[PDB]
Design a protein around this nucleic acid. Structure first.
Ligand code: DCP
Ligand code: CA
Ligand code: CA
Ligand code: CA
Length: 902
DNA sequence: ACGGGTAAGCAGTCCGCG
DNA sequence: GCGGACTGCTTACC
């Protein structure tokens, strides 16, 4: 037996015992109960010397505890006295650290990941899990070990009796009277019909004991499915039987009970719930107009809506065959989405790295508390007691005020992982604080005028001095996560570059039948592959393109989420629930960044005045925290439309000017700033990102800024990737906002593409056609979106109260128009909503209306709102005002002037 | 309780203004 | 009868 080391699955604390589920050395799943004996520490005199020193070198003495409750009355007793009680007071983590004293290398094929969704017919409307009034009438449950979809289908219920489900009919196309259940899963569905609900649940509980999930997921499974099936079994069989959903027989019900409802969260000891919706909100870097599975599915996977007739509420009685097919597809849908985004994998990686419960990957603070503590166990150090602190504003990034205008030629540069780098460069840590110095005003450091803070320590322009010689835990531990990011980024950019090869190739689609190639898209297509691609068919290239984008999304996920974590350690230092919170360090970081950016603004202005020849002229037109945006018009003039054959030539050129002259200069400038602050290590690595301009010989303006955080740019090269066709990089404007209607986002963007690529005549032409045709766009397409908070607070007898938002006012008028009948869907406090304006003297008695997003409005009122919609207002408010924004800034009109020729 | 600050633009109210 | 300054709210950007 020359083989693998054990690895935990879950862990819990009940009283004076730890409940752990793990995978042993022969790969079998197990449970133990352990009366863990923890150790906390206390200071002692300089003399009682030993192993343990706090992070400041103050000696400490370790204390046996008999059990965990015994060590907790000690932490309370030490506060009753008023001395610091050191050590890790979350014992699940100490236990994990004690048991798994090594880099955990873990096998996912051995971890049970279950994915489920239920269906619960209600003619009452939305079925609150806290009550669970209504029968659970279908469950689908996918198990990653077995690799099967277990279907529990209830044929008999007070809401209707139905025929068994046919897997043959599910397989067939929609077009053949079937449900289009993906055939790569037909062979994996185990189907189980049932007499009656009781019999189905009892069988589901027995199924769960045999195949108890470790990671439990699915869509919206924390706030609906789990608590509904808990409360349901609890109402029908009793708590005892309900507690079966826990492998340890412990649940918690914490009440948190709306402004008037009964929403509880239910925790199942010994299971790690990773609600995919929470994973998606945290790790996907999107902001969506709706978070229904239909919606997100169609966004991530480009699959269809998933249609049907009648309202979902009467669906099981009318087409039970589809009701079940749809439940199965929903579960698979989440799998399809996880196969793209890979957030489960992320979570496992991250979680086993820190040695935490996996559901603690939602908490950067947990995540770092544990990494840091593991890193300090190692050197026999003892961690601080966490302290109460009052909350406190403090300053962040600098942002240059730009002159609103157009900018023909732009070229950007940005610093690598800024704040993480600053920590590394400066050696910022709880335990590396040397002292302070007398701080001169910020600009004196920017202008390289103020006295050198210190000769011996590493400094930040907020007055902090750090030990330059030793190693900080934080810097150390952030360097390890940064190095993993570097690598996954590499794969992702490669993947992106490889995709542009493929897109170029798609104007030579070679009339032929082939299969796609066999390459590893994380690495730069070696020349022989590149030559092979030039001969392939569309069918084939297209399959490679799609495979590349899945490889790149994979890498994006891994990369941007380590960026998230490290930037989140920075954040934690400004958050009072973090054991190492310190505004001294938070501000050392932001203030140094303020300086860094401004310092290099001054520099880049200097160098480009020297070499361009001119003097005291603005070359940096904008910048945000780590960014600079340099006007390259004068670098181009220096040649002209002389020997530039095509759009690519000057792009080749600039790429070359930046890489061969500017980044050398920039490195010189920052090396000098590091000498000034006497930092530990030079890590201000500013390289080039974007390269933007009109196509050659165009009327296109290349770029514009309206104000801070609001610009567009027509970009030909980004971080080394040369685009096949130019890509708009729009930051801040209305095209990028989830609040603005899809159709206008589309339109506003095509307008921008025209301003930037095909001057003023192109815009005005297209604008004319948007104005005429705008009125027959589908209403869902031209509605606004808003989050819906504090509805209750602005109610006041069915009507708008003092200071009531337009969108909240919208819901109130919905609530008035569906008043009475429970048939129609309710707007949920906190969710999102569509929003249309209404004309003068409409039947709804108000100037707009709102319904919950991702849906068609109720049929009840649909035909009325469609005919009372105010397109006039729609277009002025959401298209025109924004457009005037963009064109004012860039010195342009969208409508032909009063010619004076006339 | 459970990463951070910065900043834009929309709408509502309350006030000055022949 | 309406514009601007202030404020609450939403959603972007690092
Ligand atoms: N959610 C975020 C995003 C950014 N930032 C801060 C920390 C970043 O270091 C700094 C610069 O932002 P960037 O968006 O340019 O990201 P980075 O510089 O960290 O990494 P990179 O540009 O290599 O992707 O802004 C942050 O604190 N939190
Ligand atoms: Ca950066
Ligand atoms: Ca940046
Ligand atoms: Ca970069």
């Amino acid at each position: 037996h020359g083989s693998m080391k054990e690895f935990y699955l879950t862990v819990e604390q009940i009283g004076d015992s730890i409940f752990e589920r793990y995978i042993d050395s022969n790969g079998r799943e197990r449970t133990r109960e352990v009366e863990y004996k923890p150790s906390l520490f206390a200071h002692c005199p300089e003399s009682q010397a030993t192993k343990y020193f706090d992070i400041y070198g103050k000696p400490c003495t370790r204390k046996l505890f008999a059990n965990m409750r015994d060590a907790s009355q000690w932490i309370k007793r030490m506060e009753d006295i008023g001395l610091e009680a050191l050590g890790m007071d979350d014992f699940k983590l100490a236990y994990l650290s004690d048991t798994y004293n090594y880099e955990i290398k873990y096998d996912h094929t051995k971890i049970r990941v279950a994915n489920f969704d239920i269906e619960v017919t209600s003619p009452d409307g939305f079925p609150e899990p806290s009550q669970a009034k209504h029968p659970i009438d279908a469950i689908t449950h996918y198990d990653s070990i077995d690799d099967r979809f277990y279907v529990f289908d209830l044929l008999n219920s007070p809401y209707g009796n139905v025929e068994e489900w046919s897997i043959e009919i599910a397989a067939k196309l929609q077009e053949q009277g079937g449900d289009e259940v993906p055939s790569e899963i037909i062979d994996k569905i185990i189907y189980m019909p049932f007499d009656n609900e009781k019999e189905l649940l009892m069988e589901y509980l027995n199924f769960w004991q045999q195949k108890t999930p470790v990671i439990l997921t699915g869509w919206n499974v924390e706030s609906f499915a789990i608590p509904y099936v808990y409360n349901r079994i609890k109402n029908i069989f009793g708590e005892s039987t309900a507690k079966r959903l826990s492998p340890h027989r412990k649940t918690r019900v914490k009440v948190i009970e709306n402004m008037y409802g009964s929403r509880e969260i239910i925790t199942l000891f010994g299971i790690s719930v990773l609600d995919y919706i929470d994973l998606y909100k945290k790790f996907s870097f999107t902001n969506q107009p709706s978070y229904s599975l239909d919606y997100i599915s169609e966004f991530e996977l480009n699959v269809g809506k998933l249609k049907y007739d009648g309202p979902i509420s009467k669906l099981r009685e009318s087409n039970h065959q589809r009701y079940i097919s749809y439940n199965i597809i929903a579960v698979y849908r989440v799998l399809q989405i996880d196969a793209k985004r890979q957030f489960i994998n992320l979570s496992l990686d991250m979680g086993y790295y820190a040695k935490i419960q996996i559901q603690s990957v939602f908490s950067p603070i947990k995540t770092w508390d544990a990494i840091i503590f593991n890193s300090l166990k190692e050197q026999n150090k003892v961690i601080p007691q966490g302290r109460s602190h009052p909350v406190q504003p403090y300053p962040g990034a600098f942002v240059k005020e730009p002159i609103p205008n157009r900018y023909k030629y732009v070229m950007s540069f940005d610093l690598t992982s800024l704040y993480p780098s600053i920590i590394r460069q400066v050696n910022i840590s709880p335990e590396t604080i040397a002292g302070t110095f007398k701080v001169a005003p910020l600009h004196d450091y920017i202008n390289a005028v103020a006295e050198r803070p210190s000769d011996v320590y590493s400094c930040s322009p907020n007055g902090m001095m750090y030990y330059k010689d030793r190693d900080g835990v934080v810097p150390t531990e952030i360097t390890k996560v940064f190095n993993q990011r570097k690598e996954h980024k590499g794969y992702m950019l490669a993947a992106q570059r490889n995709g542009e090869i493929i897109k170029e190739a798609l104007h030579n689609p070679n009339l032929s039948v082939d299969e796609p190639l066999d390459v590893d898209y994380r690495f730069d297509f070696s020349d022989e592959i590149k030559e092979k691609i030039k001969k392939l068919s569309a069918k084939s290239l297209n399959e490679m393109l799609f495979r590349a984008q899945r490889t790149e999304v994979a890498g994006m996920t891994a990369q941007i989420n380590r960026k998230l974590l490290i930037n989140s350690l920075y954040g934690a230092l400004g958050n009072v629930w973090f054991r190492y919170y310190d505004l001294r360090n938070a501000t050392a970081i932001t203030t140094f960044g303020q300086m860094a950016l401004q310092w290099i603004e001054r520099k880049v202005n200097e160098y480009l005045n020297e070499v361009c020849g001119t003097e005291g002229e603005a070359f940096v037109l904008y910048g945000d925290t780590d960014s600079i945006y340099v006007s390259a018009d004068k670098i181009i003039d220096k040649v002209g439309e002389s020997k530039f054959r095509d759009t690519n030539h000057w792009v080749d050129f600039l790429d070359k000017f930046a890489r061969e002259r500017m980044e050398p200069a920039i490195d010189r400038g920052f090396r000098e700033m590091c000498e000034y602050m006497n930092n530990k290590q030079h890590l201000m690595f500013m390289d080039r990102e974007a390269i933007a301009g009109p196509p050659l010989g165009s009327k296109g303006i290349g770029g514009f800024w309206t104000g801070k955080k609001r610009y567009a740019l027509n970009v030909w090269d980004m971080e080394g990737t040369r685009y096949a066709e130019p890509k708009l990089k729009i930051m801040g404007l209305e095209t990028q906002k989830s609040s603005t209607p899809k159709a206008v986002q589309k339109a506003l963007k095509e307008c921008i593409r025209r301003m930037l690529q095909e001057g003023e005549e192109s815009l005005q032409e297209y604008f004319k056609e948007f104005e005429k045709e705008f009125r027959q766009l589908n209403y869902i397409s031209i509605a606004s979106v808003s989050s819906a908070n504090n509805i209750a607070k602005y109610d006041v007898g069915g009507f708008p109260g003092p200071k009531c938002p337009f969108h909240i006012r919208g819901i109130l008028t919905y609530n008035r128009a569906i008043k009475g009948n429970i048939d129609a869907p309710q707007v949920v406090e906190g969710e999102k909503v569509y929003v249309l304006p209404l004309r003068e003297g409409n039947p709804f008695g108000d100037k707009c209306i709102a319904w919950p997003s991702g849906t068609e409005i109720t049929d009840l009122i649909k035909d009325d709102v469609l005919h009372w919609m105010d397109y006039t207002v729609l277009l002025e408010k959401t298209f025109i005002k924004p457009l005037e924004g963009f064109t004012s800034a860039a010195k342009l009109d969208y409508e032909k002037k009063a010619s004076l020729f006339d």
